[PDB]
């Protein structure tokens, strides 16, 4: 269906290329699975020689880590704020790797810092994903603190 | 059409023939729907009947899940109605018939739910005896209340022989405990070496 071969592309000089064999099963691809937000759902895959893969169609209640106090706690996922490569994913609410989100601060026990205090009055905090959702099958990430919060907030919608 | 009927409580099945003027009553009825036997004949008064299968004039069977009057050709797989497999994972096309009953139905398979007034001389009268017994000892002991666990002997004392399967499941259950005996003593031998290995160093 979808191949990853290299025999079809042009040469370094720009001349055309010619094929001599059919499509092999060794280089075999799949379509994109866009992980949405909703009620949870996980389907299984079969890879080469056993080795089962997990893909997540609709994800909820991802895990996150507090960097200062060094504890890990679960939270809900509300909205997406920024996506690096394509800016259309923010209106469709798809979660991929390295895309910042907005999480509930209910179970989280935060320390007293100047920056997080004003958002902690409301329910929301910020986090950034660090795991492949479509292949591992679950999201994990870090909570934004310090100058890392200064970098992303210049890129927000405003 | 000629109807096929069977008795689930008696184990007898028989065939019968319909007049033509009762055949138009049975049109547009999905497989799996009950109907009263009064509209078919006067002989079948008080009878409750249910449709469960049928064949075509060319021999093609009728499916359950397709909901059409005419012929269809789907890609069947293992276990469906119409295709009996001979290899593994090998699926192919066939030709089946839809669920609803029209003028091209040739025979019908009909179950008996509730007996009417009159008894059938060949269907409802005689009973056919059962033929096979379970091999599992736990349900074999429930029908014949014997506590001393002489399954073949007390059946010979009751005397058609039945061969139980309690010997087979006992064999691998003995072999499963056989591994745990030899595996556990292995953990003692390396620990006696380990404490001895740390005495010098």
């Amino acid at each position: 269906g979808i191949n990853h071969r290299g025999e079809h592309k042009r040469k370094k000089s720009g001349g055309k290329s010619v094929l001599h064999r059919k499509k092999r099963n060794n280089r075999r691809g799949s379509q994109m699975a866009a992980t949405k937000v909703g009620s949870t759902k996980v389907v299984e895959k079969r890879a080469r020689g056993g080795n089962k893969k997990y893909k997540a169609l609709r994800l909820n209640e991802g895990e996150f880590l507090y960097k200062s106090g060094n504890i890990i706690n679960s939270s809900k996922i509300i909205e997406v704020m920024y996506h690096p490569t394509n800016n259309d994913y923010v209106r469709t609410n798809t979660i991929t790797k390295s895309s910042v989100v907005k999480i509930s601060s209910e179970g989280i026990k935060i320390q007293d810092e100047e920056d997080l205090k004003e958002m902690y009055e409301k329910g929301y905090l910020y986090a950034v994903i660090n795991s492949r959702p479509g292949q591992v099958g679950k999201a994990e990430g870090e909570i934004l603190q310090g100058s890392k919060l200064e970098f992303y907030t210049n890129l927000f919608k405003k | 059409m000629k109807l096929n009927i069977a008795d689930p409580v008696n184990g007898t099945q028989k065939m019968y023939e319909i007049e033509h003027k009762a055949q138009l009553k049975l049109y547009n009825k999905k497989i799996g729907d009950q109907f009263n036997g009064d509209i078919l004949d006067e002989k079948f008064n008080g009878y409750v009947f249910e449709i469960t299968g049928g064949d075509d004039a060319q021999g093609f069977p009728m499916s359950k899940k397709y909901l059409t009057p005419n012929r269809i050709r789907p890609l069947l797989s293992k276990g469906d109605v119409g295709y009996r497999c001979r290899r593994k994972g090998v699926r192919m096309r066939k030709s089946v018939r839809g669920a609803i009953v029209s003028e091209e139905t040739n025979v019908l398979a009909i179950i008996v739910i509730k007996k009417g007034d009159n008894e059938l001389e060949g269907l409802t009268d005689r009973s056919n005896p059962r033929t096979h017994l379970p091999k599992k000892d736990k349900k074999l002991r429930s029908m014949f209340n014997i506590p001393e666990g002489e399954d073949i002997v007390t059946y010979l004392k009751d005397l058609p022989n039945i061969k139980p399967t309690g010997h087979i499941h006992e064999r691998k259950r003995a072999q499963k405990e056989a591994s745990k005996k030899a595996h556990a003593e292995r953990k003692a031998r390396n620990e006696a070496q380990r404490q001895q290995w740390l005495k010098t160093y």
Binding site: - | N190, Q193, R194, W197, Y201
Partner: protein, 87 residues
């Protein structure tokens, strides 16, 4: 290799002209076996290990045995008995 009948034992190594030979040996040599270490590291739960050429694993050996030294396998208790260093 040996036959249980007739008490015949042989050691297998090459001759002189790159061919396989079989040399009859004694019962005092019939016990043991020689091999050569290729790799050594510490496995799970802090247990040392030494890996030979054929793929046997051995633990809790003498710390004076290095990566390239040879061992002497008893072949009946499957325990490392003697070693010869590399120099």
């Amino acid at each position: 290799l040996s036959i249980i009948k007739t008490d015949e034992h042989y050691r297998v190594f090459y001759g002189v002209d790159k061919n396989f030979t079989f040399i009859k040996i004694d019962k005092e040599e019939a016990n043991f076996k020689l091999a050569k270490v290729t790799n050594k590291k510490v496995m799970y739960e802090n247990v040392p290990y030494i890996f030979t050429n054929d793929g046997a694993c051995f633990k809790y050996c003498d710390p004076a045995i290095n990566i390239n030294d040879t061992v002497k396998i008893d072949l009946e208790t499957r325990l490392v008995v003697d070693y010869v260093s590399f120099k």
